[PDB]
Amino acid sequence: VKLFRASEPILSVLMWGVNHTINELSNVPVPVMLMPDDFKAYSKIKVDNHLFNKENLPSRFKFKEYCPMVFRNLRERFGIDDQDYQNSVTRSAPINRFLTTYDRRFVIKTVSSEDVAEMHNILKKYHQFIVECHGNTLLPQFLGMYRLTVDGVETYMVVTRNVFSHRLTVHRKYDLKGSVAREASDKEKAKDLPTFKDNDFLNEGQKLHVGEESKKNFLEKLKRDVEFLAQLKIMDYSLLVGIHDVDRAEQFGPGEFDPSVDVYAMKSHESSPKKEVYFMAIIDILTPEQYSKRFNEFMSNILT
Amino acid sequence: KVKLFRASEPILSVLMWGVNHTINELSNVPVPVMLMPDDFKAYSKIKVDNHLFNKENLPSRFKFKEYCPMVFRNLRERFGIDDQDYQNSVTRSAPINRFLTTYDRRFVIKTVSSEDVAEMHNILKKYHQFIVECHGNTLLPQFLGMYRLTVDGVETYMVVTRNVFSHRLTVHRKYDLKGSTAREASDKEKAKDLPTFKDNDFLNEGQKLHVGEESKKNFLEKLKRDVEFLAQLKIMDYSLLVGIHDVDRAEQEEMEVEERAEDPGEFDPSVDVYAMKSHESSPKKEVYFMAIIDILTPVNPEQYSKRFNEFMSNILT
Numbered sequence: 001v002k003l004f005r006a007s008e009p010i011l012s013v014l015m016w017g018v019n020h021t022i023n024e025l026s027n028v029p030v031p032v033m034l035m036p037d038d039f040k041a042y043s044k045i046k047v048d049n050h051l052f053n054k055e056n057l058p059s060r061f062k063f064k065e066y067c068p069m070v071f072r073n074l075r076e077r078f079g080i081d082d083q084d085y086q087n088s089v090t091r092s093a094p095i096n097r098f099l100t101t102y103d104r105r106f107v108i109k110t111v112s113s114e115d116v117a118e119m120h121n122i123l124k125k126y127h128q129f130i131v132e133c134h135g136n137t138l139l140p141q142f143l144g145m146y147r148l149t150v151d152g153v154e155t156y157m158v159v160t161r162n163v164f165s166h167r168l169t170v171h172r173k174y175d176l177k178g179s180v181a182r183e184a185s186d187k188e189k190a191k192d193l194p195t196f197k198d199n200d201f202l203n204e205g206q207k208l209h210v211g212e213e214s215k216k217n218f219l220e221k222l223k224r225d226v227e228f229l230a231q232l233k234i235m236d237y238s239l240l241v242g243i244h245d246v247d248r249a250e251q252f253g254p255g256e257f258d259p260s261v262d263v264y265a266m267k268s269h270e271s272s273p274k275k276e277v278y279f280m281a282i283i284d285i286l287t288p289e290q291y292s293k294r295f296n297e298f299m300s301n302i303l304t
Numbered sequence: 305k306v307k308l309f310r311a312s313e314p315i316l317s318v319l320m321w322g323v324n325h326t327i328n329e330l331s332n333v334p335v336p337v338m339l340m341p342d343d344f345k346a347y348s349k350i351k352v353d354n355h356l357f358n359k360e361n362l363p364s365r366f367k368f369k370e371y372c373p374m375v376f377r378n379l380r381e382r383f384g385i386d387d388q389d390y391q392n393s394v395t396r397s398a399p400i401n402r403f404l405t406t407y408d409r410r411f412v413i414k415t416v417s418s419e420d421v422a423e424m425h426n427i428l429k430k431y432h433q434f435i436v437e438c439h440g441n442t443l444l445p446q447f448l449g450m451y452r453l454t455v456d457g458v459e460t461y462m463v464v465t466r467n468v469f470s471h472r473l474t475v476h477r478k479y480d481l482k483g484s485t486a487r488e489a490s491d492k493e494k495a496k497d498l499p500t501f502k503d504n505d506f507l508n509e510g511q512k513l514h515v516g517e518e519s520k521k522n523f524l525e526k527l528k529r530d531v532e533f534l535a536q537l538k539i540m541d542y543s544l545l546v547g548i549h550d551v552d553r554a555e556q557e558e559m560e561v562e563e564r565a566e567d568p569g570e571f572d573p574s575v576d577v578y579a580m581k582s583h584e585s586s587p588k589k590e591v592y593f594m595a596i597i598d599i600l601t602p603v604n605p606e607q608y609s610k611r612f613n614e615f616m617s618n619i620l621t
């Protein structure tokens with residue numbers, strides 16, 4: 001029995017909706033190809049329950065899923081099974097707008113109306129790029145996109161594969177742009193999990209040691225990705241970098257992970273210094289050349 | 305395990321979709337210790353607007369309303385029907401024949417009027433209680449679900465019952481009996497393969513049903529408290545549906561179907577709930593199906609129940 005019990009009705013509706021749309025899709029045949037109309041398609045469901053099932057869910061709400069054939073195909077190309085995705089969302093309330101599913105596998109971001117417009121704008125090309133690069137990219141992996149109507153209010157959400165591991169504690173993070181100059185404010189330096197920027201990183205002189213093995217794949221990925229973004233005329237995106245220090249965590253194995261689940265994770269080299277696991281991906285792509293070459297060079301000068 | 309909701313009419317597709325949907329939702333809703341008054345005024349409602357999606361069998365746009373779902377879930381449970389079975393009976397393949405049967409012939413789906421839905425509501429509390437205290441042992445219709453579908457802005461009301469007839473055993477003759485003081489079948493009806501015969505038809509044939517005394521007593525005790533119950537409410541003009549299954553004739557028919565394709569009379573009393581074998585000293589081996597039908601649509605109730613009762617009691621031996 002899934003109750004869809006959550007801290008807030010919006011979360012309940014999200015759970016119910018992912019459950020309903022995934023189950024509904026299990027009845028829809030996997031097509032031979034996507035069609036143009038699948039990129040303009042949606043499912044809308046409206047619920048009005050009088051005196052029934054009101055313990056966790058509201059009596060009246062709406063749930064809208066954008067382009068469900070497209071995002072279902074994207075899930076497949078990212079190696080994600082529909083039942084696991086459904087399970088991660090519905091087995092237990094997602095947790096702390098920015099949420100994670102209870103198992104930390106998937107991120108759920110509340111976004112604006114124009115974000116959803118922009119997603120419709122890039123979705124065809126993004127899909128075609130995911131096809132051509134065989135799912136091997138550092139771009140956000142867009143798994144689903146929904147609009148919830150609760151208490152008359154519309155809330156838009158986009159679901160991604162988590163950049164960080166769902167298991168390994170991240171010990172310090174960086175939002176890097178390659179840009180100007182930006183750092184962490186005194187108020188930002190106070191949180192246990194601080195978000196550092198380019199200059200903090202550079203001035204710290206901290207490098208990341210993945211060898212020449214991982215460096216190859218990574219840079220080969222990064223260039224194709226930013227070339228794609230530039231071809232779309234998009235900018236202001238970042239490279240999110242997470243660092244998990246193994247010894248500290250230690251103080252069911254240290255540094256042990258399943259690469260097919262922690263897709264962005266990289267082991268520190270042996271000849272390198274301290275022992276770490278790194279997590280690196282491109283975030284916030286929903287908004288030119290200069291930006292791409294610059295970002296690329298900045299991120300390339302971080303791997304030794 | 306893919307379910308397509310393929311059907312000849314959008315109405316059937318939506319019915320299959322809605323039963324599938326409501327039963328799956330109910331699986332995520334714990335079973336209460338008891339029912340509460342609100343469950344009798346309760347309903348669920350779902351409105352679907354699909355755009356450029358999932359349009360092969362379902363309409364893009366439709367509505368589905370289930371009346372008092374907690375109550376009907378409970379009534380199913382008291383009638384010895386598992387929710388997954390009910391759902392599979394409705395959704396694995398399209399119901400057939402508005403009068404529908406599920407593809408496996410276990411459940412009957414009747415299209416009713418808005419007034420019929422109204423009357424179900426009026427009587428639902430008392431019907432439930434009566435089902436509680438007679439332990440699901442009744443000749444009354446066994447109500448398993450009530451729905452409203454909206455397709456093309458048009459509303460259709462539907463009530464689901466257990467089939468009076470066997471889901472496997474062929475019916476060879478049927479009567480609708482009231483006990484009214486002239487009720488016969490038209491020359492038109494008589495020209496159907498399976499005519500609905502009536503009182504005077506039953507009487508004139510000298511037809512009897514030989515069930516033997518234990519079965520007869522059980523049946524008559526049921527009939528008695530059932531028709532008293534109906535008399536207590538406003539209810540009049542209901543009927544006893546009677547189906548007769550000829551065992552030998554069926555055996556032969558089976559043999560003939562095999563011969564065609566090439567180029568007993570037992571049954572589960574927990575599934576064919578209205579079925580009685582003939583007395584081991586009957587002129588021929590038969591199986592009978594007997595139950596009360598048409599109790600919703602409502603010389604007065606008391607009188608009617610008394611008469612109906614007398615007549616039905618002189619039907620069998």
Ligand SMILES: Nc1nc2c(ncn2[C@@H]2O[C@H](COP(=O)(O)O)[C@@H](O)[C@H]2O)c(=O)[nH]1
Pocket residue numbers: 098107109160161162163164175195240283284
């Ligand atoms: N755990 C986790 N945090 C993320 C992820 N993406 C962005 N964040 C972080 O979440 C915060 C808000 O995200 P943003 O406003 O960029 O969407 C920032 O601190 C950002 O670094 C992710 O995929 N996983």
Ligand SMILES: Nc1nc2c(ncn2[C@@H]2O[C@H](COP(=O)(O)O)[C@@H](O)[C@H]2O)c(=O)[nH]1
Pocket residue numbers: 345421422423425
């Ligand atoms: N649509 C709707 N009709 C109702 C409701 N309650 C009673 N009715 C209908 O209103 C009429 C009178 O109901 P009463 O209150 O007299 O028993 C009947 O036709 C009955 O079916 C309700 O909650 N909704």
Ligand SMILES: Nc1nc2c(ncn2[C@@H]2O[C@H](COP(=O)(O)O)[C@@H](O)[C@H]2O)c(=O)[nH]1
Pocket residue numbers: 344345346418419421422425426452
């Ligand atoms: N007594 C009663 N009648 C209802 C209720 N809901 C609907 N009805 C009756 O059922 C019929 C159809 O209702 P509708 O669901 O289309 O609003 C109408 O005759 C309406 O009055 C209810 O909760 N109680």
Ligand SMILES: Nc1nc2c(ncn2[C@@H]2O[C@H](COP(=O)(O)O)[C@@H](O)[C@H]2O)c(=O)[nH]1
Pocket residue numbers: 403412414466467468469480500545597598
């Ligand atoms: N097979 C079957 N036929 C029924 C059942 N109830 C009613 N019928 C038949 O269906 C036709 C119309 O139903 P009614 O007008 O009673 O709703 C009549 O021929 C009637 O005898 C049932 O439970 N099973």
Ligand SMILES: Nc1nc2c(ncn2[C@@H]2O[C@H](COP(=O)(O)O)[C@@H](O)[C@H]2O)c(=O)[nH]1
Pocket residue numbers: 556560
């Ligand atoms: N009562 C009865 N009729 C039979 C039997 N075998 C054949 N008949 C009938 O005799 C006719 C010829 O049957 P056929 O043998 O050509 O299938 C048909 O009317 C058929 O129903 C039987 O074993 N018992």
